[PDB]
DNA sequence: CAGGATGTATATATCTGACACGTGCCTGGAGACTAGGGAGTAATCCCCTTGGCGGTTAAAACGCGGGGGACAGCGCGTACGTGCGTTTAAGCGGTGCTAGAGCTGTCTACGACCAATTGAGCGGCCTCGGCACCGGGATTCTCCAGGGCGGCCAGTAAG
DNA sequence: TTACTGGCCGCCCTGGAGAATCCCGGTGCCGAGGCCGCTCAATTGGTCGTAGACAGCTCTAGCACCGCTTAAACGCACGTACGCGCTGTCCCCCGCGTTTTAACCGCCAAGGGGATTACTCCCTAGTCTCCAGGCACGTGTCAGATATATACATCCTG
């Protein structure tokens, strides 16, 4: 049969998303993760359909960042894929811990 | 200045003091302005070797080796400092310097 | 809803990383990003809440989260 | 001439927390920037909350909001209960 | 009548007064009610009575009466949450809290 | 060691003086 | 006297009543001068006056007239004396400039 | 709604292109948070010098320090401009 | 007029901070590198500075402007001036 | 034969590592730092006089901005498995702050 | 190198839901006129930076060995990606319901404002104890030369 | 024939020999802090004007549910690229003397500019009155989404 070496899908995956801006986490499954978290700070939240949006393209984004920064520490380990020690060292470094 | 043939080579050292040995009593530059040389009783906590004493002696500072470490010569291991008796320390020095690498065959030999 | 962050997937990682610029992604990642995000949220909503808990309503609106998040220094665009 | 400060009353407090020890003047002009600071943060914070509601004053609850926005963790919690304690007890006094 | 200064009436320590100007001189809303300041001093007046009796804490166990800002830095960022506050704060002749990483150590 | 803190008590305790 | 607008008399386009009106109701200062807000509604134009300039280039590259948000993230990102005065903020439905690091690369 | 605003400047720096109802909101929410950092540094600025009104002056001064670069030499640039337009009349 | 100061951080003193740092062994290139870090960060620090100075008209930069440059890049800094 | 007794290279820059650390002088030479400052402010606007605190106000920051770069660069070293920081960690540690 | 297979890019045509323009409207802004309070403008003075002087010693520069980490190479084996097949539930489009967002109107409690009053917190003086400093022993830390200890063959005891 | 203990090489922890560091006992030094005027900002007693607290009401927007298509998830198989552990090699930085240097300290000064007042002025806040530009809503062509069907583009795999 017919297959691609490893890796070549991987590039073939990033130019279809990297040139693309629409949302990637799944709506209907970070609704459901939005409800469960505001629970335990306060009970019988009503979220505007508008400001589950305003969390999603905040928190795709948060993580595309942080995506980016362990790419760069895993290159710098001389490897290529990130772990979550590259996780960990991309937000130390950040201050953000 | 002196060097001191310590072994198979010599090493740099620096003149601390100059000595008559029959007259029994040394002349050393005290430490730190600019300390003049004074004449002293050869001290009886101080040892002498025989070769540095039977001519003029003196004790020595080495270059690299801190003054707690610093110990004394003989005479025969001074030659007045020369170009010449650096190149023979370097010769020496290079002829120490495989004779770790000939050493080192036997650990290769050891090793395989 | 016991647990919804499970529901974020495999591939839901997997296609964001992939927008990130990476090539090979560890499995240990997929969970490991899951403990990011989820203390990211509870950050943002924590404000997001407060600011609508002082105006006395009962509902997040979207003007909440944009100020919500313009505190954590991620300033959001695009909705108030 | 006179640049006015907290340091009589940071000075006033340390001997409540600690009878004996006092406190170096580089070590002062700290605290008196440190108040000088968290003043600004939460003051500046409800002047946004009271600004966003479209409220033009600035009353204590706008200060709650405030703090449990800036102060993280335990101490949200605990300012806010030493909040309340004081007020409660002002008006009443009054 | 007798004068009681609104700092007493409040119990508080610090100045209920000279916040209450303050909030209207440095221009945070066209006006400000008389309970704003009453519960500022006292947020104020709670933590910093919070730095220094962990301040304090620090110098006894350095064999020194005095607080001084080595024993500030190390009353701040000890702590959790208030390095959580503090977190962008650089205190002047405040040294560092000693840390050396593991593998750094000999063996 | 010579200089310690040892950390004695983190948690909050509210003002037991007061 | 017809009246004529302050925006128009300073020749700018965006309004500077309405700018001096927001100075003063926010509550920056107790006093705002005449011509404090004149010059901020010039800077203001400017910033606009350079984004929707590169974004504007952007649709003719990319052969599509109407300016999606994603025109706006490329035309901030690419250029860095803007990017930087943009560090912080997100842009929603805006992606990320495209690039793979050079070791990813096969 | 700074949004009209928007219109009119896009429509002048390119007669033909358009702009998405989005777009418009990150700009009606771009301009706006630029206008408050600028003036908010505005106010503080003021404050340290002891200064009461904020000016002409004060708005210039702030921008040079939030506009990195060429920006801050063309719009203070442009401002001056429309200063000495306005006196002009 | 000042020339060539730069290279006035005595290299010692690059490695003496990063022994309060943390770090053991210190490559031969990062001296050279560091300057051009903290030359980077004056720039930035005593310009906002300056321009306070020129601001109020006052020839000396005071203590008190420094305190400002470093509070709006998010450097806060504690018990100078206030 | 002859030996100073050397320590091990390693074990004396812990040792002064635990030396600094603990204390809290200033690093950087006062005078050779003052000398740069004046230089750069010069570049801006010529003829400036710096208060003397104003001097020492940078100083104090500088190095605690460094302090914080090292810090940081450290941690990437350490990530390399490695000990010895290098310049292309100090790029690294700078990137990933976003400061640039 | 040669060549099929693949994926994205490219063209033509077909709808639409959506942004651009029209039109009415009313609310914020422009005209016009002060008023006093903020801002600029002039000596002045003094205190506080810049500047030079010389001793001096703490420290920076420099030199050399070698000890250990940087780095390159390599063997590998497993945790990855890729593809298929199945199976979930996400998205779409509705139906029906109602909490609750947003807005109105009423009017009372609250805060701005002011004059007179007074004591809190200011600057300035002065002091003596907490502490930095130094000295020399006592004590700890580190480095290293000499030193008991399983792993092998050799000759062992022998089925 | 088989069988396997002993001997010699194998090779540690442990004392010492220093260096580094702590302990403690004085020995001044100066600023932490206590005290003293005093003044100017906080306090008190009163009015006035309205911001918002409060109550009621109109509709939006959100929640719940649900039935259908189908695209995304999930699990299994597999084959191989890479993380990693090991070895080996060598260069380069740490360690520690020497040798040079310029920071520092203390000391004097000079004049420069930041900090007061006086004065005087002119500019923006406040207010009233009129109207047209910005807003909201309506609509109506239309550029973009969408479906479908070529034209190369890279990717392996010999």
Redesign the interface.
């Known amino acids: 049969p017919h297959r691609y070496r490893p890796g070549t899908v991987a590039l073939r995956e990033i130019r279809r998303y990297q040139k693309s801006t629409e949302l990637l986490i799944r709506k209907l499954p970070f609704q459901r993760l939005v409800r469960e978290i505001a629970q335990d700070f306060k009970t019988d939240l009503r979220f505007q359909s508008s400001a589950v949006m305003a969390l999603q393209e905040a928190s795709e984004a948060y993580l595309v960042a942080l995506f980016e920064d362990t790419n760069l520490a895993a290159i710098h380990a001389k490897r290529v894929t990130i772990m979550p020690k590259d996780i960990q060292l991309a937000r130390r470094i950040r201050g953000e811990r | 200045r002196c060097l001191a043939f310590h072994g198979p080579l010599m090493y740099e050292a620096k003149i601390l003091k100059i000595w008559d040995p029959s007259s029994k009593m040394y002349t050393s530059i005290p430490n730190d302005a600019t300390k003049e040389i004074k004449p002293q009783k050869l001290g009886e906590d101080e040892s002498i070797p025989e070769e540095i004493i039977n001519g003029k002696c003196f004790f020595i500072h080495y270059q690299g080796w801190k003054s707690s470490w610093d110990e004394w010569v003989g005479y025969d291991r001074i030659r007045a400092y020369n170009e010449e008796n650096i190149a023979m320390k370097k010769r020496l020095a290079n002829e120490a310097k495989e004779a770790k690498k000939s050493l080192l065959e036997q650990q290769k030999k050891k090793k395989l | 809803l016991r647990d919804n962050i499970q529901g974020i997937t495999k591939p839901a990682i997997r296609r964001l990383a992939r927008r990130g610029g990476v090539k090979r992604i560890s499995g240990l990642i997929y969970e490991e990003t899951r403990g990011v995000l989820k203390v990211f949220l509870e950050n943002v909503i924590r404000?997001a809440v407060?600011?609508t808990?002082?105006?006395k309503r009962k509902t997040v609106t979207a003007?909440d989260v944009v100020?919500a998040l313009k505190?954590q220094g991620r300033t959001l665009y695009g909705f108030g | 001439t006179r640049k006015?400060?907290?340091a009589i009353?940071?000075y006033?407090?340390?001997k409540?927390?600690?009878p004996?020890?006092?406190?170096?003047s580089?070590?002062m002009?700290?605290?008196?920037?440190?108040?000088?600071?968290?003043?600004?943060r939460?003051?500046?914070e409800?002047?946004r909350?009271?600004?966003?509601?479209k409220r033009?004053?600035?009353?204590?609850?706008?200060?709650?909001?405030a703090?449990?926005?800036?102060?993280?963790?335990?101490?949200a919690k605990?300012?806010?209960?030493?909040?309340?304690?004081?007020?409660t007890?002002?008006?009443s006094?009054? | 009548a007798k004068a009681k200064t609104?700092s007493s009436?409040?119990?508080?320590?610090?100045?209920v007064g000279?916040?209450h100007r303050?909030?209207r001189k440095?221009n945070?809303?066209?006006?400000?009610?008389a309970?704003?300041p009453?519960?500022?001093?006292?947020?104020?007046?709670?933590?910093?009575?919070?730095?220094?009796?962990l301040?304090?804490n620090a110098?006894?166990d350095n064999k020194k009466?005095?607080?001084?800002?080595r024993?500030?830095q190390l009353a701040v960022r000890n702590d959790?949450?208030?390095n959580?506050?503090?977190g962008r704060?650089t205190?002047?002749?405040g040294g560092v809290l000693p840390n050396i990483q593991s593998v750094l150590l000999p063996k | 060691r010579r200089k310690i803190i040892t950390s004695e008590g983190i948690?909050?305790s509210?003002?037991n003086?007061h």
């Open positions: 404000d407060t600011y808990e002082h105006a003007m100020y505190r | 006015e400060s907290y009353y940071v006033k407090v340390l409540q927390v600690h004996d020890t006092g406190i170096s580089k070590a002009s700290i605290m008196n920037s440190f108040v000088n600071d968290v003043f600004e939460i003051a500046g409800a002047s909350l009271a600004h966003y509601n033009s004053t600035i009353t204590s609850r706008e200060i709650q909001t703090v449990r926005l800036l102060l993280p963790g335990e101490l605990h300012a806010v209960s030493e909040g309340t304690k004081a007020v007890k002002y008006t006094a009054k | 609104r009436r409040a119990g508080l320590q610090f100045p000279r916040v303050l909030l440095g945070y809303a066209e006006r400000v009610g309970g704003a009453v519960y500022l001093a006292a947020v104020l007046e709670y933590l910093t009575a919070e730095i220094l009796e301040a304090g110098a006894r009466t005095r607080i001084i800002p024993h500030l959790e949450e208030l959580k506050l503090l704060v205190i002047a002749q | 948690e909050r509210f003002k003086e």
